[PDB]
Design a protein around this ligand. Sequence first.
Ligand SMILES: [Ca+2]
Lengths: 51, 51
Amino acid sequence: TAVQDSNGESWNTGLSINKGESAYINANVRYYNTGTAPMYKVTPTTNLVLD
Amino acid sequence: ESNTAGDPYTDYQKASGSIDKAIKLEARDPLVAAYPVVGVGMENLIISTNE
Ligand SMILES: [Ca+2]
């Protein structure tokens, strides 16, 4: 006859990532006017170029 | 016909020059149609493999 008493412990850490949407970009910008007239409802279109 | 070339501008509007000033002076002739020809060209292509 035999009796066995076991006690365990575990620790896990994972890390997942998607490779089509790996990060998000946030740009802090500022508009400048160097002409003779004011512009109401300024709506710029910009390019974010990386290499 | 008031628009000989078939564009939005009459014969007088074209010949008299009283149209948009960005139009080429070619199209100031009632026979030459004021007519834009726009095309697109791809320059490079990026692939984002979402695994
Ligand atoms: Ca005519």
